[PDB]
């Protein structure tokens, strides 16, 4: 029990070619945080796939090899703010919320000293990575009942938001940059907008609850229970005259019985309307007649 059991991410030990395919695909979800990788960007971090499907190099190192590629780099390191780089790199790989200012400040002192590659080596080669999941599973949505900071669950759930949703904020990105038109913006970049956490990180307080709610996986008892309830009929014999439509401005008034009769009529001439494909198939038989001419030309 931590709500991990409600979610479902499989990663089997590698048994066939299939398991290789599912595992690779789930990795490029999680590394890219559901970003859309096309063929060319699929062909960027190639070499780690070969070294992983060969099994010569373990799984955490496939994740490292994909993170070191130019595409992930240009999306999540390059056109983001320094903070935003840290909590993105932190979200994709460790799957948590940065716990405190010290943790983030130490990563940023590491970036000013050394830069991006030694960072990714720091996120991979951190211990909490390895005991959290090491070479066994892909990174995922971490639930753990014991939380170092109650805030961890909170900011992590604001990081994740909706399961369908993704990181880019062109509209947010569009307004701050001087562009009238958002779609006029380059879409390769886009992960760099203001850092959503850093207000809460530096001040240490008042994390919003609306954002937190989205990330919660859907609870089979609570939020499903309120949603559907339209039962019974108060009268055995109520006749409403509702309105059906047989165009934009042409309107029919019928009762349910009579509308049923009307629809059955539409079915009666719907067989009639679906007759036309027999004419199509007969017309195609004519192709054979054309072929016969080819046969005559071969015999001549």
């Amino acid at each position: 029990i931590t709500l991990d059991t409600l979610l479902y991410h499989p990663t089997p030990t590698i048994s066939g070619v299939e398991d290789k395919d599912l595992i690779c695909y789930s990795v490029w979800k999680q590394v890219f945080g559901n970003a859309y990788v096309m063929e060319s960007e699929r062909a960027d971090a190639y070499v780690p796939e070969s070294m992983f499907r060969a099994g010569q190099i373990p799984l955490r190192e496939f994740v490292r090899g994909v993170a070191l590629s130019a595409t992930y780099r240009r999306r999540f390191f390059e056109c983001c703010g320094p903070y935003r780089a840290v909590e993105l790199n932190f979200r994709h790989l460790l799957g948590r919320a940065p716990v405190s200012q010290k943790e983030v400040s130490e990563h940023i002192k590491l970036i000013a000293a050394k830069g991006f590659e030694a960072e990714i080596n720091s996120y991979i080669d951190s211990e909490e990575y390895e005991e959290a999941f090491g070479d066994d599973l892909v990174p995922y949505m971490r639930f753990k009942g014991t939380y170092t900071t109650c805030e961890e669950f909170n900011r992590m759930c604001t990081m994740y938001s909706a399961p369908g949703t993704t990181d880019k904020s062109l509209s947010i990105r569009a307004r701050t940059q001087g562009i009238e038109n958002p779609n006029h913006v380059l879409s390769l970049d886009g992960a760099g907008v203001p850092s959503k956490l850093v207000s809460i990180i530096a001040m240490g307080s008042h994390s919003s609850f609306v954002p937190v709610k989205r990330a919660l996986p859907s609870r089979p008892d609570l939020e499903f229970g309120q949603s559907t309830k339209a039962p019974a009929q108060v009268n055995e014999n109520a006749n409403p005259v509702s309105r059906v439509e047989v165009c934009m401005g042409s309107y029919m008034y019928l009762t349910a019985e009579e509308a049923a009769q009307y629809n059955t009529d539409v079915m009666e001439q719907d067989q009639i309307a679906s007759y036309a494909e027999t004419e199509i198939s007969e017309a195609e038989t004519e192709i054979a007649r054309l072929q016969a001419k080819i046969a005559e030309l071969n015999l001549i």
């Binding site: 029990i1 409600l6 479902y8 991410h9 499989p10 599912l22 789930s26 089979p220 008892d221």
Partner: protein, 164 residues
Amino acid sequence: MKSVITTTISAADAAGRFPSSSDLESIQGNIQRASARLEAAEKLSGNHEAVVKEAGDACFAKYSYLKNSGEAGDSQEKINKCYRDVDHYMRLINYSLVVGGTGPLDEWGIAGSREVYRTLNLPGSAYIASFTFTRDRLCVPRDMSSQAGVEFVAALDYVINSLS
């Protein structure tokens, strides 16, 4: 709420692919074993009260020290908590019996049972005495068909193997 169709939809979603013929064969088997499951659910909804009555009475029959001091159900109220909890158990066996997977029974009743049972000093073996009483007692041809009886026995066996 693991079932046939939830497993296949979650799996084809995990591939990210459209549902091939395999999943269709799986839910075809779901509507195969459906009739036996639902017949069992109908009869369980029939006489659940006497089921809980025999189960609880057999449970205090095997262990008298539940009514000893002050360690367990030493009041009429706590024995009402007894038939209450067995009503919930038969309610979950009904639910999973309808679904055809152990899923609602798992996520509502099974998950984290052992922490509550070790914490509020509840021995699981008395529950096992109740379920094994209803296990031993099931009819051979007399009420439901073998599949209906087999299905019920299977579900209750899952309860026992998940309890202790």
